[PDB]
Amino acid sequence: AMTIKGRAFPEGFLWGGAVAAHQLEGGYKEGGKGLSTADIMTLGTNERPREITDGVVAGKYYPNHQAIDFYHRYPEDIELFAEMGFKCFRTSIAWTRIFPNGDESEPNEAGLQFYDDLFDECLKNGIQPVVTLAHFEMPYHLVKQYGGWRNRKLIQFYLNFAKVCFERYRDKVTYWMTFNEINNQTNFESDGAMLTDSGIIHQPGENRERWMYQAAHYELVASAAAVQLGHQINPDFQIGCMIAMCPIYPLTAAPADVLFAQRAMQTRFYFADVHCNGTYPQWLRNRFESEHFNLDITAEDLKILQAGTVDYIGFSYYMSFTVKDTGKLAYNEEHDLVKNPYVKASDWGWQVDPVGLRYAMNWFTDRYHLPLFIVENGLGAIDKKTADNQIHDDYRIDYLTDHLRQIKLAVLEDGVDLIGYTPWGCIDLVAASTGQMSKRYGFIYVDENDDGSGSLKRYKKDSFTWFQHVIATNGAEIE
Amino acid sequence: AMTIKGRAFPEGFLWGGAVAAHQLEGGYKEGGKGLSTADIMTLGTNERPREITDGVVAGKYYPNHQAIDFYHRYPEDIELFAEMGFKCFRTSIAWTRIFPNGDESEPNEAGLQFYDDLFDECLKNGIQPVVTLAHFEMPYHLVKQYGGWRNRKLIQFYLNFAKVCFERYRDKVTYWMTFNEINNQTNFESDGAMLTDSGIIHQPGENRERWMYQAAHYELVASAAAVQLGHQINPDFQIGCMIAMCPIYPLTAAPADVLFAQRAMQTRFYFADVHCNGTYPQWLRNRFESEHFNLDITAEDLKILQAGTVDYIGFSYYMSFTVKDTGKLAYNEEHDLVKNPYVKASDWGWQVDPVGLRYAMNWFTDRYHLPLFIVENGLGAIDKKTADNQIHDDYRIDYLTDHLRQIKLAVLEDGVDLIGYTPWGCIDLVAASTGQMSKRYGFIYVDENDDGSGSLKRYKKDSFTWFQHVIATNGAEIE
Ligand SMILES: OC[C@H]1O[C@@H](O)[C@H](O)[C@@H](O)[C@@H]1O
Ligand SMILES: OC[C@H]1O[C@@H](O)[C@H](O)[C@@H](O)[C@@H]1O
């Protein structure tokens, strides 16, 4: 029964922080940038959904247009990351800075130069960029013109973008991921998931589930083609998938509940099966037939999938879910979840379950036997900044400490292969679900309110010093 | 929502029945046969354990000595199997008929001739033998002389036996399995599991768990060496493992219960991980270190394991288990199970859970992506034979029908790759746990009582006609 206190994480462990371009950069039309799917989502709340508009509508507030102005302020924000001691910085390359409309024959030089400048600023401070190519910010032109990822043509458009980035940043970036949280669209009834993952805005009469699987198929093919392409450009690239890991528990030991939870996880994680094993699960191929989807899946696609399996599994962890049998062995995330009575929840309703992260790490390890990278984890919570500009975020420290304890057990005791750990929203940024600044994740407070007002000044929260010390001690004190 | 009624199992499906040599043959010293570990186990009950004696003790009744005399009666019993329409017959080759003491330099010809005669009788009736090499009947001399599978020397002794069988029956047997229910010894406190799997009779002061893992290691190495050897002798052999598949559910959605059940299944099924993936799970290698086992595991062993992974997973299914968190993340099967309040149980306390078999089939498929073969399934129950020699075993038909429904769903809807299905104890035989005849599994009633008395006549139960019709219709009517 030996303590984990005093034992560090492995040597070479990548501590850092994670963001996405559209949530912090602002500068949404600077440098020739095109309009993205993030730029058409208005401000919402936990109770009122963001509105998805047909382009920019006069008079409406779009939080992603200016965000926190990291497009201009990155030198000073990176200084703060370096003060905390980050080894890496996980962000996205904005697709619309490189291919503003998506279907150009040549990339945008000003966009490429922006990321050279950003990555150089990181590297000058000893911080390695870790890059996600698709992160909920595809060109709105591809949505309007082609129907988004309904259209097979997007595979090549994505690959044109991937190729440019892999070549330009060949000597600057080692770790890449293809499609952020590709499996959010498991909830095929979620307008937000469908737009962010796939550029799908529902058309009357369409079969939502059918089109989700078609789009996901093309994305999986594009990912596999990109893994092969990237390795041709630089064989030392590590190219991963990115899975939203919300584990799903059975409510009870009733056999039907246990089978329903197994199918729920098969449904939410088939994307990982394809990314890692290179083949579709047969239950799901059988579903396509029994639901009469008639998907466009070719022999060439299947060959690409098998040849383009990933090097590691990047994943996010925030929460777990629970299900009971509904009477039909098919999981519909919009309707089939029940609240877990054993755990508490955040103010946005997200269940707090650190033990579930140890479960999840074992689940991925035993299924796939690949290295993992925790590329998002965090607690969205209200902060109050005091008169003397302090932020006493003990609630956020507690959440992160509790999750790190379970991660540390999974690494030291269970022997999970973990590349690194990057908390989400390390500088306060625009929330995805709601567009709120008030749902704060950061170690660094940004003085911007939900209505966009404020000085935009940055202040260190108490969690900044906490995480700085975790990094300095390589997690040794966590117990 | 299409019915499965009217849809058959796949073409080429192997229906049959399963037994083990020591449970039905009798003739325990005929033809030069040596004393086995089955021949030193006395009669018990659900409440009173079988006694394991040091060799044969005068005056005690050993049910396996004469069993049901299939050693002499096989021609007439096989006629009954052929009348039911079996495609295959799953049995073991008695290790002690081939190598009576285990360490001989040459095999026993009379033993080899017995299996030529038995297999020829099957094949003359169009029934293919399916053979398990080790099935709870190893030579007692190896236990006494070497300490059973505590001793590395048993690897070669097992391989001498395997080689002889593979060569002799090269043109008669396609499907082989190495070690029956290799994972029963997960319960390292079970005297029965330790003797039957591993030839281990506890010595005072020994660390039971440590020695279980050592023995299992040598058995896994022997299995992997045998897969390679068999394929050299006949590349068309299909050589499988044999896992006792009791799935383990969490009692509730409490995160600690879910993690404990995950570890319980990792513990009970690491054997499958080794047989299929070719490597130990890291959590378990870490356990060996933290429990200070100092196991004898060499680089050569690990190389053999990786090169000798199996062609298919043979498994038994009878029941499921449930667990709740005990406060320590280590599963001890003798103490850590709780009864599942959602299901009923047999008269020997075995939980009835057909849905769990669909769960299990998905669990193996998604973890390993190998074909499966259900080589045991059945209900041990009291039968009453009427005055007119009928046996109205509707309880047994019901159990088997309910399990076949779930199997059929797993094959037709979930797309699991299933080679065949062989109910256990197809002719009434001596129970393993207790040595009782009264715990009956068969389609064919044998008139022998728990004390060995009776005529030994065979009678068709109602389930015989039921299963004959399942085979004739290739399972099409099951709904
Ligand atoms: O992006 C953060 C989270 O958003 C939720 O809407 C999704 O369902 C999760 O899968 C995801 O991890
Ligand atoms: O042999 C039949 C059954 O015996 C029980 O004692 C074991 O625990 C099971 O794993 C096995 O399937």
Numbering used by the authors:
A (entry chain A), B (entry chain A): 0 to 478
Original authors' sentences:
The LpPbg1 structure has been determined in an apo form as well as in a complex with phosphate and a glucose molecule corresponding to the aglycon molecule. The final model also included 590 water molecules, four phosphate anions, one acetate anion and one glucose molecule. In LpPgb1, the phosphate moiety interacts with the side chains of Lys438, Tyr440 and Ser432. The ligand was most likely acquired during cryoprotection with sucrose solution (1.55 M) that must also have contained some glucose. Therefore, it was bound in the aglycon-dedicated portion of the active site. The molecule interacts directly via hydrogen bonds linking O2 and O3 to the guanidinium group of Arg267 and O3 to Asn183. In contrast to other enzymes, LpPgb1 binds its aglycon ligand very tightly through numerous hydrogen bonds. As LpPgb1 possesses similar activity, it is likely that the glucose-binding mode in the +1 subsite mimics the binding of the aglycon moiety of 6-P-gentiobiose that contains the β-(1→6)-glycosidic bond.
Specifically, the β-­glycosidic bond of 6′-P-β-glucoside is cleaved by 6-P-β-glucosidase (6PβGlu; EC 3.2.1.86), releasing 6-P-β-glucose (BG6; glycon), an important cellular precursor, and the remaining portion of the given substrate (aglycon). Here, the high-resolution crystal structures of GH1 6-P-β-glucosidases from Lactobacillus plantarum (LpPbg1) and Streptococcus mutans (SmBgl) and their complexes with ligands are reported. 6PβGlu is a single-domain protein that adopts a (β/α)8-barrel (TIM-barrel) structure, which is a typical fold of GH1-family members. The GH1-family enzymes utilize a double-displacement mechanism of catalysis with retention of configuration at the anomeric C atom of the glycon moiety.
